[PDB]
């Protein structure tokens, strides 16, 4: 019910499976010959993604799942100036 | 006075001519109803627009009944539009008027539109919870056995 | 409740959202660690076991969906866990 994500730097992050399931690419990678064995744990590693961008992605996951179908003014998502360029890259690749 | 009764009848030309004579339209009767109330009952949007053009202000009768609310009661949407557009009001009065309009569409025999009522009430209540963390309160009266359950709704579900 | 946390060990991070031992056996369920052994460090200060959420002083103002509350704790270092910190992430160019 928990999943592990591994960056190219080697940092490992543990996330609730339903939160990580939103992105289509992750779901596609899980559903297949990979991640099909019950004995093996549920982990996914990107040989490409850096650390900070992936961390921003996962806090985006929880922020989105938290303010969903809520009748109110959503808080803005803080984006650093230099981060945005690579964050767009990661969002496009993950198809979130 | 001929002004208020003419507004009730809705003859635009005679009302326009009488107003041309610079007659004060702020006159009152025994009921205390100003010509805006009679125009709202008539529902002539042009008459109300002309009355507003020469500085006719909203005035409340002793027993409530602001002309906007009176127009909303009789299922007269256009007057509600015009008055809300021109006459500045708070959040509470506007939502109250919208809810009254919804109920009037719901129960009366002239229109009897169930969907229009539902959508108007939905819009009003969505406006109630617009801000978030700053919620207009909703007071519910105790149930009446005449209506059965008789409990209002304050959550969108 | 409604308090958002990162748990950080060197090259390891856990995201989560009311006492200290509650966090301790959440960590036990996640990583199978001795609940007594785990020591929590907030601003390099020891967090005693059984301390409630309220005494922490971090409920809503810092625990944010935008940026949750950070918890720089350390796991076991032989008998007791001390001086164990997470490496910083890569600095963008």
Experimental technique used to determine this entry: cryo-EM
Check CB contact under 8 Å for A73 and B126. no
Ordered by start, the domain boundaries in chain C are 2-93
A71/B131 touch (CB, cutoff 8 Å), yes or no: no
H or E element, residue C9: strand C5-9
Return the closest-CA partner of residue C5 out of C56, C70, C50: C70
What is the resolution in angstroms? 4.2
Architecture of the domain whose range is C2-93: Roll (3.10)
Q: Do A71 and B129 touch (CB under 8 A)?
A: yes
| E-strand stretches of chain B | none
Torsion (CA) B44, B50, B54, B58 in degrees, nearest 10: 20
What residues have CB less than 8 Å from A57, skipping those under 6 apart? A87, A90, A91, A94, A96
Q: Are B2 and B35 in contact (CB under 8 A)?
A: no
Nearest C-alpha neighbor of C27 from the set C52, C57, C49, C45: C49
Task: Report the alpha-carbon distance of residue A76 to residue A28 in Å, rounded.
Answer: 29
A4 touches chain C (CB under 8 A): no
Chain A adjacent subunits, 3+ CB pairs under 8 A: B, C
Does residue B138 contact residue B152 with C-beta atoms inside 8 Å? yes
Rounded to a whole number of angstroms, the distance from the CA of C15 to the nearest CA of chain A is 6
Instruction: Give how far the C-alpha of residue B2 lies from the chain's centroid of Cα atoms, to the nearest Å.
Output: 24
Element (H, E) at A83: helix A83-94
Q: Do residues A19 and A65 lie in contact, with contact meaning Cβ atoms separated by under 8 Å?
A: yes
- For chains B and A, having 3+ Cβ pairs within 8 Å is answered yes
């Amino acid at each position: 019910m928990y999943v592990k994500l591994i960056s190219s730097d080697g940092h490992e992050f543990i996330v609730k499976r339903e939160h990580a399931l939103t992105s289509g690419t992750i779901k596609a990678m899980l559903s297949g010959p990979g991640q099909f064995a019950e004995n093996e744990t549920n982990e996914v590693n990107f040989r490409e993604i850096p650390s900070h961008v992936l961390s921003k992605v996962c806090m985006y996951f929880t922020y989105k799942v938290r303010y969903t179908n809520s009748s109110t003014e959503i808080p803005e998502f803080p984006i650093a100036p230099e981060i945005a360029l690579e964050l767009l890259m990661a969002a496009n690749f993950l198809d979130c | 006075t001929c002004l208020m009764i003419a507004a009730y009848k809705g003859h635009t030309d005679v009302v326009r001519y009488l107003l041309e004579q610079r007659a004060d339209p702020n006159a009152k009767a025994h009921c205390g109803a100003t010509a805006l109330h009679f125009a709202a009952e008539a529902g002539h949007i042009d008459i109300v627009k002309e009355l507003i053009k020469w500085r006719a202000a909203i005035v409340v009768n002793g027993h409530g009944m602001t002309p906007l609310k009176v127009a909303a009661e009789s299922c007269k949407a256009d007057v509600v539009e015009l008055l809300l557009s021109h006459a500045d009001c708070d959040r509470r009065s506007r939502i109250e008027a919208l809810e009254l309009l919804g109920a009037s569409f719901a129960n009366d025999r002239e229109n009897y539109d169930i969907i229009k009522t539902y959508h108007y009430l939905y819009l009003a209540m969505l406006e109630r919870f617009q801000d978030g963390d700053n919620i207009l309160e909703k007071e519910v009266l105790p149930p009446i056995h005449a209506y059965g359950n008789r409990t209002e709704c304050r959550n969108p579900q | 409740m409604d308090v958002f946390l990162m748990i950080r060990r060197h090259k390891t991070t856990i995201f989560t959202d009311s006492t200290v031992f509650e966090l301790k056996r959440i960590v036990e369920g996640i990583l199978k660690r001795p609940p007594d052994e785990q020591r929590l460090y907030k601003d390099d200060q020891l967090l005693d076991d059984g301390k409630t959420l309220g005494e922490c002083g971090f409920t809503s103002q810092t625990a944010r969906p935008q940026a949750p509350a950070t918890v720089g704790l350390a796991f076991r270092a032989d008998d007791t866990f001390e001086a164990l910190c997470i490496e910083p992430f890569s600095s963008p160019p």
